[PDB]
Amino acid sequence: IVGGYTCGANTVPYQVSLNSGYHFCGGSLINSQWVVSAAHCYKSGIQVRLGEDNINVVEGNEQFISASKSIVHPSYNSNTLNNDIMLIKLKSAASLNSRVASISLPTSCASAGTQCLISGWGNTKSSGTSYPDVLKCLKAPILSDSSCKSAYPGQITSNMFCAGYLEGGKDSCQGDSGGPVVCSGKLQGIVSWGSGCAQKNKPGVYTKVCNYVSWIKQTIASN
Numbered sequence: 629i630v631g632g633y634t635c636g637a638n639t640v641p642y643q644v645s646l647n648s649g650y651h652f653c654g655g656s657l658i659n660s661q662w663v664v665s666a667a668h669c670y671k672s673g674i675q676v677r678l679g680e681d682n683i684n685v686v687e688g689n690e691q692f693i694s695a696s697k698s699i700v701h702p703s704y705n706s707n708t709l710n711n712d713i714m715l716i717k718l719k720s721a722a723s724l725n726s727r728v729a730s731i732s733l734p735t736s737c738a739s740a741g742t743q744c745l746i747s748g749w750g751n752t753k754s755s756g757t758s759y760p761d762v763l764k765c766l767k768a769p770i771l772s773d774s775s776c777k778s779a780y781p782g783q784i785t786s787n788m789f790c791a792g793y794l795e796g797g798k799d800s801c802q803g804d805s806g807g808p809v810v811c812s813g814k815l816q817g818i819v820s821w822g823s824g825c826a827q828k829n830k831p832g833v834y835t836k837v838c839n840y841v842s843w844i845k846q847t848i849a850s851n
């Protein structure tokens with residue numbers, strides 16, 4: 629996260645780190661046994677780490693649970709990142725508590741200008757690299773269709789939205805991928821892509837989770 633702030637330990641209790649001997653992506657807990665992340669975060673050997681604040685230190689409240697399955701959207705396209713969403717089933721259910729909690733799926737898409745919370749352990753530098761130990765937060769508005777498509781002509785599908793700031797300095801970034809964009813208590817977005825981080829007129833692009841609620845529920849129900 630670039631231009632963000634220290635969230636505070638466990639203030640984002642649905643926030644998850646995907647780990648494979650290191651942090652590589654974020655995710656969101658949507659029930660005790662399922663996490664939502666990005667398809668480009670797919671890999672084998674995923675350990676899900678819940679209740680994390682300092683990802684480099686065992687502080688208490690952590691739960692490490694291996695993924696039993698990782699389900700990439702069958703229509704995911706790695707070239708364009710359309711359908712950049714993945715479901716991860718945990719080997720065992722998480723124990724839910726104040727510090728480990730699910731985030732609600734939306735019942736309606738969000739509108740332009742809606743303010744959302746974006747969080748992650750990704751790079752905190754627009755240029756260069758600095759990865760934080762503790763969770764970073766960023767408040768960001770959802771941008772208009774035209775703005776978004778103007779930012780990235782022919783690159784924006786109906787399964788994508790822009791959120792962020794056109795003036796630069798505040799964006800999601802590397803390491804934040806697959807993490808949540810939560811608006812009014814609903815998971816509306818997944819960190820998907822962008823051109824660099826926090827560059828002027830190049831805002832963050834996010835998977836439009838409201839288009840996948842049916843898919844999400846049918847897939848979970850069948851697995």
Ligand SMILES: [Ca+2]
Pocket residue numbers: 680681682683684685686687690
């Ligand atoms: Ca920790």
